[PDB]
Amino acid sequence: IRVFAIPPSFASIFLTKSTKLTCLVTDLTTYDSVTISWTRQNGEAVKTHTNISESHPNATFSAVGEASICEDDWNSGERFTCTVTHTDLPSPLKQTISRPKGVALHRPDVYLLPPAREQLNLRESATITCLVTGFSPADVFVQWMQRGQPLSPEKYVTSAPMPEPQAPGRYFAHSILTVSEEEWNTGETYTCVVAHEALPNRVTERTVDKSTGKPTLYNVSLVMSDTAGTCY
Amino acid sequence: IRVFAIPPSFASIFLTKSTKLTCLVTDLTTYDSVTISWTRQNGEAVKTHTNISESHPNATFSAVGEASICEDDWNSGERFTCTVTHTDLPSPLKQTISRPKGVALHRPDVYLLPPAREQLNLRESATITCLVTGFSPADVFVQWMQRGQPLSPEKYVTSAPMPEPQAPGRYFAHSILTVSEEEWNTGETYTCVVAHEALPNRVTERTVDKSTGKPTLYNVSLVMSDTA
Amino acid sequence: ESATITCLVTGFSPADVFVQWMQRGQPLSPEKYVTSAPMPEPQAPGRYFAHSILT
Amino acid sequence: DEWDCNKGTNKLYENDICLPPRRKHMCTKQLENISTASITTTDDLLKEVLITAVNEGKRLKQQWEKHFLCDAMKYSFADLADIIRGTDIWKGNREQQKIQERLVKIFRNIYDNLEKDEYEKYKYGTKYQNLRSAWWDAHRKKIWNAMTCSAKEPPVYDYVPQILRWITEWSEHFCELQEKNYYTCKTKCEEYSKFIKKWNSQYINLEKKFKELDENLIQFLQNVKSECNEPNTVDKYLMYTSDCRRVKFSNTID
Amino acid sequence: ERIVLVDNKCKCARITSRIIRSSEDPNEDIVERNIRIIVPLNNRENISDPTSPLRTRFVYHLSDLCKETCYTYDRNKCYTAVVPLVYGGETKMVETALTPDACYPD
Ligand SMILES: *[C@@H]1O[C@H](CO)[C@@H](O[C@@H]2O[C@H](CO)[C@@H](O)[C@H](O)[C@H]2NC(C)=O)[C@H](O)[C@H]1NC(C)=O
Ligand SMILES: *[C@@H]1O[C@H](CO)[C@@H](O)[C@H](O)[C@H]1NC(C)=O
Ligand SMILES: *[C@@H]1O[C@H](CO)[C@@H](O)[C@H](O)[C@H]1NC(C)=O
Numbered sequence: 115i116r117v118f119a120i121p122p123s124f125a126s127i128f129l130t131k132s133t134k135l136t137c138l139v140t141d142l143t144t145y146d147s148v149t150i151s152w153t154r155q156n157g158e159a160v161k162t163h164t165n166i167s168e169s170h171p172n173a174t175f176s177a178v179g180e181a182s183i184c185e186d187d188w189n190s191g192e193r194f195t196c197t198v199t200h201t202d203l204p205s206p207l208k209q210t211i212s213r214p215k216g217v218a219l220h221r222p223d224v225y226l227l228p229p230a231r232e233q234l235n236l237r238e239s240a241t242i243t244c245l246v247t248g249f250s251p252a253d254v255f256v257q258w259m260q261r262g263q264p265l266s267p268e269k270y271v272t273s274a275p276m277p278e279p280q281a282p283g284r285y286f287a288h289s290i291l292t293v294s295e296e297e298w299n300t301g302e303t304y305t306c307v308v309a310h311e312a313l314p315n316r317v318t319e320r321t322v323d324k325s326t327g328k329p330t331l332y333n334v335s336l337v338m339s340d341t342a343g344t345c346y
Numbered sequence: 347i348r349v350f351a352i353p354p355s356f357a358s359i360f361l362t363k364s365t366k367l368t369c370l371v372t373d374l375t376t377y378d379s380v381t382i383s384w385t386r387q388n389g390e391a392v393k394t395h396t397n398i399s400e401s402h403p404n405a406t407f408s409a410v411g412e413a414s415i416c417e418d419d420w421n422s423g424e425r426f427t428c429t430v431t432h433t434d435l436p437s438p439l440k441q442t443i444s445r446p447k448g449v450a451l452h453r454p455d456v457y458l459l460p461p462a463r464e465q466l467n468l469r470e471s472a473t474i475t476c477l478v479t480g481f482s483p484a485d486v487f488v489q490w491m492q493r494g495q496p497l498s499p500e501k502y503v504t505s506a507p508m509p510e511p512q513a514p515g516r517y518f519a520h521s522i523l524t525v526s527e528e529e530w531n532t533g534e535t536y537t538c539v540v541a542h543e544a545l546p547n548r549v550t551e552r553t554v555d556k557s558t559g560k561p562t563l564y565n566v567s568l569v570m571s572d573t574a
Numbered sequence: 575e576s577a578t579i580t581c582l583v584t585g586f587s588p589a590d591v592f593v594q595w596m597q598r599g600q601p602l603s604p605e606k607y608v609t610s611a612p613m614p615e616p617q618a619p620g621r622y623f624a625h626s627i628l629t
Numbered sequence: 630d631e632w633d634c635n636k637g638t639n640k641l642y643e644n645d646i647c648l649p650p651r652r653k654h655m656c657t658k659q660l661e662n663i664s665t666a667s668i669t670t671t672d673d674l675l676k677e678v679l680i681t682a683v684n685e686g687k688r689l690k691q692q693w694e695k696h697f698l699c700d701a702m703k704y705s706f707a708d709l710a711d712i713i714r715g716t717d718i719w720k721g722n723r724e725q726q727k728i729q730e731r732l733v734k735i736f737r738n739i740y741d742n743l744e745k746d747e748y749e750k751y752k753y754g755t756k757y758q759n760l761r762s763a764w765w766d767a768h769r770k771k772i773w774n775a776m777t778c779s780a781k782e783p784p785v786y787d788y789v790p791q792i793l794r795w796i797t798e799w800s801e802h803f804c805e806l807q808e809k810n811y812y813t814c815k816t817k818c819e820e821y822s823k824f825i826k827k828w829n830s831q832y833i834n835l836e837k838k839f840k841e842l843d844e845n846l847i848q849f850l851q852n853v854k855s856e857c858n859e860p861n862t863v864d865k866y867l868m869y870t871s872d873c874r875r876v877k878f879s880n881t882i883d
Numbered sequence: 884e885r886i887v888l889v890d891n892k893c894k895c896a897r898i899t900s901r902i903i904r905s906s907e908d909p910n911e912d913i914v915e916r917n918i919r920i921i922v923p924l925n926n927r928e929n930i931s932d933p934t935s936p937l938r939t940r941f942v943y944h945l946s947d948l949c950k951e952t953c954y955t956y957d958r959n960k961c962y963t964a965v966v967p968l969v970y971g972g973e974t975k976m977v978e979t980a981l982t983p984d985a986c987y988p989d
Contacts (some may be wrong), residue, residue: 115892124464125970126970128977129413129968129975129977130970130973140368148503152960155415157574157976164900170355176475188950195912198977199922201945221983221987223465223468224462225459225462225464225465226462227461227462227475228462229457229459230457230458230459230477233457236598239512241457241458241477241479243475243520245462245473245475247465247473247919250573257968257969259966259967260964261934262934264965264967264968264969264974266971268511269511269512271508271509271510271511271913273508273520276503276525277503278503279500279501279502279503279522279523279524280471280501280524282475286522288475288505288520290477290518292511292512303436303933303934305933305934305966307966307968312985313980313983314980314986314987314988315977315978315979316427316977317966317968317977317978317979317980318926318979318980318983319933319964319981320464321933321934321964321981323936325937326937326987327926328460328559328564329561330562330565331561331562331565332562332563332564332565332924333496333563333565333939334565334566334567334922334924335563335564335566335567335569335940335941336567336568336569336922336941337567337569337940337942338569338570338920338941338943338945339569339570339572339942339943339944339945340347340571340573340574340944340946341571341572341918342929343570343896343946343949344946344949345888345889345949346888453599455599492755492756493733493756493757494737494738495737495753495754495755495756495757496752496753497753497754497755497756498753498754499753528641528642532641532720546601574944574946615666617659618666619666619667621666
């Protein structure tokens with residue numbers, strides 16, 4: 115039996131605006147007699163399970179709950195917890211989700227690193243990283259789009275945030291894209307977007323291309339004309 | 347009552363320069379006449395548990411033993427026996443560990459990446475990343491050396507091997523290190539040693555420097571004129 | 575026609591070194607490189623050196 | 630008696646600090662002209678450091694005869710301590726880069742020829758400065774004894790970070806030279822106006838970096854803040870032996 | 884002693900003019916028409932839209948500057964672009980900060 119609880123995502127509030135949140139139990143027998151009571155310092159639960167995913171490859175069970183709680187109430191930090199009402203479980207386990215007050219908040223300094231010279235020379239698929247440095251401990255959602263076309267998340271992998279070696283407070287992350295050598299050879303630009311707090315609109319974008327992927331040619335044609343002119 | 351035995355990995359062997367074995371007992375408090383011994387599959391007692399570890403108060407016994415003499419025999423995959431015997435248990439409890447076989451041994455291909463220009467312009471701190479990738483077994487130990495000395499494990503951070511989507515058997519990883527802007531503008535060298543089973547020499551080094559990334563040509567065409 | 579890349583080991587006392595040439599991670603055949611035996615340094619008391627060339 | 634506080638090549642890092650004249654024109658040629666081939670052991674390295682200390686002592690003795698000598702020699706010992714320890718600031722000098730490039734050979738050989746019960750303790754570090762400091766602290770007592778031959782207890786300013794010590798030489802030098810300044814008046818008056826303006830902006834530029842109260846620098850500042858009852862002061866109150874904080878420094882002529 | 888005749892901050896031109904006078908002699912004054920230009924070398928044709936190629940040519944017809952499209956940012960004026968974000972089947976477009984170093988509230 116694997117039990118996990120997911121707080122609402124920072125990219126779910128910003129994009130979907132519906133504060134979905136639940137605690138999940140998986141790899142256990144299905145009984146279809148579960149309604150997870152939620153505690154707001156009170157016993158009432160606003161909503162029961164809907165669109166619950168009972169179907170599993172191993173015929174195991176899962177639980178899905180949803181609610182709507184004010185954003186300022188979450189900012190206050192009340193100890194919302196979920197109580198399982200599974201008939202199989204004799205003792206209902208207590209799982210509490212609440213972000214503490216006073217957590218650090220800072221903006222992600224996103225730098226994009228061009229691929230290595232050696233990998234392109236070897237004539238196979240390149241790899242491009244999207245470094246995210248110093249962002250707040252909240253989980254961040256990042257995706258990759260090329261020339262404004264949102265790519266599928268199937269071929270890039272993101273790393274869970276880890277404590278920064280230099281700063282005990284801040285965090286960092288990574289994300290890599292594998293693309294064909296001829297695509298990067300043609301010079302198509304690629305963009306990385308971050309979605310985290312402490313920003314004017316909570317979204318930052320950076321991009322490079324072959325002509326800006328640590329190049330060797332600076333083809334400048336500085337062509338100043340009409341130098342004398344007339345002015346006052 | 348339950349006994350858990352885990353074998354050492356490549357990182358432990360490389361860092362400790364010796365083979366250490368654990369035959370650890372869980373949920374068992376302090377009693378008398380507790381016997382732990384690691385013996386050869388052939389039958390002989392290759393090594394005893396000299397300097398036995400003190401029992402943890404919370405029902406945990408370490409009972410670790412060193413097969414330091416037989417470095418290659420562990421790599422051969424020969425099975426090891428742990429003998430756990432107590433007065434209450436009639437049948438002695440046995441723990442068996444061995445090297446797995448059948449896995450692939452694709453080689454890593456490390457590519458060390460210099461810091462970005464935007465980070466350098468802010469003049470705060472550069473972060474050099476070491477994108478180890480391609481290894482088929484999921485065991486990699488990465489250290490950083492500056493002028494022939496391993497850097498402290500506080501300054502760098504290694505991420506766990508993450509599965510690679512393009513190929514099932516292969517994996518990848520990465521690590522970062524926070525170099526000061528002054529010490530990188532000075533133009534020093536940093537090395538990313540990777541330790542893996544599949545490497546024929548079992549170690550590989552790479553080097554980066556301020557001179558690693560520079561443009562070649564600066565063709566400028568100043569076309570000053572007076573009449574449009 | 576040909577090129578002769580050298581590999582100047584130096585400064586080592588215990589007189590035993592192993593020199594091997596790898597191209598793209600695959601070791602080169604031993605028929606290409608020719609390793610010189612350790613010979614003492616002129617200006618150093620007890621530290622040797624050696625060479626290695628590749629065609 | 631000039632400090633040459635402009636950037637130039639005095640200090641690589643962009644913050645302005647005024648180098649003392651005692652750092653400039655030192656007899657560092659003994660360590661500068663070392664032969665890493667002929668030296669590979671701790672015992673041979675100690676003798677040359679003792680020789681360099683003796684040369685520094687006789688250099689200061691000859692310089693003064695062209696308590697104050699004791700103070701200058703004290704800070705010179707601290708400076709040589711910083712040079713040996715490898716945490717010095719004067720990286721810009723082309724001569725002083727070679728010394729910190731060829732002591733690495735000596736201490737790498739020493740670290741190579743070590744035994745196991747110390748190898749595991751000194752395995753991890755950067756540029757071998759951990760066992761460099763260990764070697765200094767092991768052989769610190771003998772060096773000052775060889776230095777003090779010209780004209781006891783081991784000095785304590787060598788653990789002090791260099792920037793604050795540089796402030797201390799500045800305080801001593803400025804009080805000494807203002808005592809030297811004075812002891813009709815129209816002839817003398819115009820030089821004092823030039824005396825102020827040659828060092829007028831010398832005080833203000835460092836004060837802007839006294840904020841944020843290096844890795845090891847901050848811990849000493851935090852600890853001294855807990856004591857002495859004066860955590861945040863632009864004046865350290867260490868060996869000032871005169872009035873401070875702009876009281877008689879500026880426009881005292883009128 | 885100089886007056887900035889043209890200070891186009893999106894082209895970075897800083898044309899000044901000074902009168903340096905010869906000493907203790909009649910007037911052979913020489914007129915400084917100083918010019919200072921700081922080229923990007925990495926900015927694109929679109930100063931804001933980042934999917935454009937680089938700009939190499941740096942045409943400065945100073946007749947127009949003395950009395951469209953330009954290549955140098957300005958610090959006070961904030962720039963903006965809109966990108967599509969996908970959480971799944973649906974999408975939402977949210978504008979970004981191309982120069983967030985000086986665009987967050989202060
Ligand atoms: C490239 O430059 C053109 C103008 O030279 C720009 O087009 C408009 O720019 C304004 C500036 O704020 C935007 O508000 C408009 O939305 C842009 N037009 C369109 C159709 O988006 C723009 O910077 C670039 N062109 C495009 C098509 O993005
Ligand atoms: C370099 O610039 C010249 C003149 O502007 C142009 O003719 C040439 O095609 C350019 N080459 C490259 C590789 O950009
Ligand atoms: C560099 O620029 C010149 C014109 O200034 C151009 O003729 C030349 O082709 C450029 N170099 C390359 C490699 O394209």
